[PDB]
């Protein structure tokens, strides 16, 4: 119905597919038939950042933060095969799509926490004995959190990993010892965890919807400082097909 000249600017292009309160259906899983996920969407809604320990080991919590970017957060076009291995459980294997978005949120104090909201190489599974996906179903799994910046990124003073300066070019005769940290750009790579909990179904069309929560790490800045912990709470659509 709605087209491009229909959505452009409304920012509806970031929010993704809903299911009118009719859901609660059940999509029959054949097991004798191969299933795949046409389009898996993940729409961020809330970002929290565990307050850096106070040093005083007294249970740090995840505080809310303000989105300093715009409506450039959603993950969409994600697809891959929804494998039906033994014991009825389903396993989704992420194949390709717009599975990552650089988000930057301004935190309570003053800071600005840029993270790489993603679900790359995601592989989520469900409860054993899954017959007809229902509101009781849900997936969980890990995924790879690449690295905010690529090997090619240069810093304000020129230094970089796969390219760029070797050192503090502007301080020719200073001690390199203490500048090491920032002159050698390391490229991290870590694991992230999610869990999509189905809230609506449409037995017919074969499309489920729901809420998701994932936890990952922030940007370490080519390893200049420690990364902050993030938790993302959003919504997700998912069109399943044989």
């Amino acid at each position: 119905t709605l087209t491009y000249d229909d959505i452009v600017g409304t920012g509806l292009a970031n929010k993704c597919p809903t299911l009118d309160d009719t859901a609660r259906g059940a999509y029959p899983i054949d097991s004798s038939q191969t299933y795949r996920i046409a389009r898996l969407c993940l729409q961020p809604t809330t970002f929290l950042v565990k307050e850096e320990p106070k040093n005083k080991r007294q249970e740090a919590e995840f505080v809310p933060t303000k989105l300093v970017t715009r409506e450039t957060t959603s993950l969409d076009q994600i697809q891959g095969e929804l494998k039906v291995n033994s014991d009825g459980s389903l396993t989704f294997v992420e194949e390709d799509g717009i599975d990552f978005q650089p988000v930057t949120v301004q935190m309570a104090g003053g800071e600005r926490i840029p993270l790489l909201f993603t679900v790359k190489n995601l592989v989520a599974s469900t409860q054993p004995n899954v017959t007809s996906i229902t509101t009781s179903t849900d997936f969980k799994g890990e995924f790879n959190v690449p690295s905010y910046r690529t090997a090619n990124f240069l810093d304000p003073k020129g230094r970089g990993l796969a390219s760029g300066y070797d050192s503090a070019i502007a301080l020719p005769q200073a001690k390199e010892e203490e500048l090491a940290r920032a002159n050698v750009k390391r490229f991290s790579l870590t694991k992230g965890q999610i869990s999509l909990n189905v809230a609506k179904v449409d037995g017919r069309t074969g499309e489920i919807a729901g809420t998701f929560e994932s936890e990952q790490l922030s940007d370490d800045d080519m390893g200049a400082h420690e990364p902050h912990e993030v938790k993302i709470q959003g919504v997700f659509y998912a069109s399943i097909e044989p």
Binding site: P146, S147, T150, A151, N152, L161, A162, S163, A180, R181, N183, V184, K185, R186, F187, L189
Partner: protein, 98 residues
């Protein structure tokens, strides 16, 4: 307790001497007879190789493609997949041009 630049370090290995099947970027193959266009995309598109010869075992290769690969194996090598060099599709567009 030393910080190390993975890329400069990798220019000590075979990488920096021969085309690394697991790391080097696709445009590296445009330096040997009929190897680029079609094979390069294959080589690269086929995960890491536990060792040079393993190229020879890529799916649906023609007894001709296979013949060439054997010819150029002497220019290939293999090293641990290095994220900094592989991540971000850097193997199809490492950001360089003329």
């Amino acid at each position: 307790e030393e910080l190390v630049n993975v890329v400069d370090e990798k220019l000590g290995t075979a990488y920096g001497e021969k085309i690394d099947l697991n790391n080097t970027n696709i445009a590296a193959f445009i330096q040997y007879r009929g190897l680029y266009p079609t094979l390069a995309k294959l080589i690269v598109k086929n995960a890491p190789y536990e060792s040079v010869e393993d190229v020879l075992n890529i799916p649906g290769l023609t007894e001709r493609q296979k013949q060439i690969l054997r010819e150029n194996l002497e220019h290939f090598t293999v090293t641990e997949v290095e994220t900094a060099l592989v991540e971000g599709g850097d193997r199809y567009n490492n950001g360089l041009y003329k």
